[PDB]
Every structure is written in C-alpha cells, then in structure tokens.
Design a protein around this ligand. Structure first.
Ligand code: APC
Ligand code: HHS
Ligand code: CL
Ligand code: CL
Ligand code: CL
Ligand code: MG
Ligand code: MG
Length: 158
C-alpha cells in the first residue's frame, strides 16, 4: 500500500532534521520510498512564538500494518530528539504524520487516517499534490479540486 507521510520540523536545523528523517524512512522494514516533495518554509499554524517550519511530503510503499508504520515513524521522531511540549501546535525537531494509508479509513484511539486536519492545511496539501497530483481521497474528493476550492496560498521553497 502507498502511505503518504507529511514531514515537519522547526527546531534544531530543520533541513538537517528532514534529510535525516528521509534517510530513516527509507530504512523502515518492508517499505521503500517512492517519491519525495520539495522542501517548503511555512509560518507556524498555531502559537507564533516559534520558528518557521520546513514542510515536505513522501510517498512510502509498505506492507507494514498502519500501527506498525506508526511505531516506526514515532521511533524516528524520538531518535531525532522529538519532545512533546505541553502546548498544542508547539515546536518540534521532527513531526511525521500519516496523511493517507492507501485508500484506507482508520478510526482508532491511536490513529486517525486520513489525517484529521490535512484538508485545512496548505503545508500538508501542496507538498502532497507535488508528489501525487492525481490523488483521490477515500471520500471521493480529488486533491486537485480541494486545493482549488480552498485556494490556499502557494508555498515558498525552503
Ligand atoms: N495520522 C496520524 N499520524 C500520526 N500520528 C497520529 C495520526 N492519527 C493519530 N495520531 C496520534 O497523534 C498522537 C500525537 O502526535 P503528535 O505528533 O504529538 C500531534 P502533531 O502532529 O503535533 O499535531 P497534528 O496531529 O495536529 O499535526 C500520536 O501519539 C498518535 O497516536
Ligand atoms: N507550518 C507548520 N505549522 C505546524 N504547526 C503545527 C503542527 C503540528 O502540530 O504537527 N505542524 C505544523 C507544520 O508541519 N507546519
Ligand atoms: Cl495564536
Ligand atoms: Cl476526522
Ligand atoms: Cl477522505
Ligand atoms: Mg503534525
Ligand atoms: Mg505528529
């Protein structure tokens, strides 16, 4: 199945963090990278007392179960010094979010796929569209059409 993973970083040299994350994603068992986006510099969604993010997206072919993929993406975050602060939307060295896991709909305590907020976030959708312009969501909506409807600002390269 093709998993689409969003990458964000706004601490500890985001470019280095993102390059390290891409290497580590390729090292996940039973999986391989298919496509990587460009790197974008985006202003924080939430609290404004934090740096700009580097955002990107990757397509990862995998035969792991979704929770097993999540175990690995969380391991990569931890090995890159991710610390969850108290505040919501606060800064982090690395955030790996599973946007889509094929055409699956997953609703569990640990894992909600499609990612619950991605359709509201240009920093998620634009890198995704770069790597998967024909994508159709589980609910039948075209990615291309969502971008048009919402008319989110285009992103700047890192
Ligand atoms: N699609 C998904 N991808 C990654 N984690 C997910 C997820 N759906 C649910 N989660 C859960 O989200 C929990 C918190 O992860 P965090 O990375 O701290 C949220 P965040 O990415 O900072 O905010 P965001 O989800 O608004 O982007 C994880 O422990 C995981 O169980
Ligand atoms: N610009 C930007 N802001 C963000 N703000 C919050 C979160 C998050 O809570 O995971 N992620 C991002 C992100 O990746 N990019
Ligand atoms: Cl605010
Ligand atoms: Cl949802
Ligand atoms: Cl959907
Ligand atoms: Mg996130
Ligand atoms: Mg996350």
């Amino acid at each position: 199945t093709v998993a689409y993973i969003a990458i964000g970083s706004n601490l500890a040299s985001p470019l280095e963090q993102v390059n390290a994350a891409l290497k580590a994603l390729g090292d996940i068992p039973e999986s391989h990278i298919l496509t990587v986006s460009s790197f974008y510099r985006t202003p924080p969604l939430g609290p404004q007392d934090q740096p700009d993010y580097l955002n990107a997206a990757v397509a990862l072919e995998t035969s792991l179960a979704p929770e097993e993929l999540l175990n690995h993406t969380q391991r990569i975050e931890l090995q890159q010094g991710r610390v969850r602060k108290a505040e919501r939307w606060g800064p982090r060295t690395l955030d790996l979010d599973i946007m889509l896991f094929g055409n699956e709909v997953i609703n569990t305590e640990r894992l909600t796929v499609p990612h619950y907020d991605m359709k509201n976030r240009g920093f998620m959708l634009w890198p995704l569209f770069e790597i998967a312009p024909e994508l159709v969501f589980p609910d039948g909506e075209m990615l291309r059409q969502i971008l048009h409807t919402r008319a989110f600002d285009k992103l700047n390269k890192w």
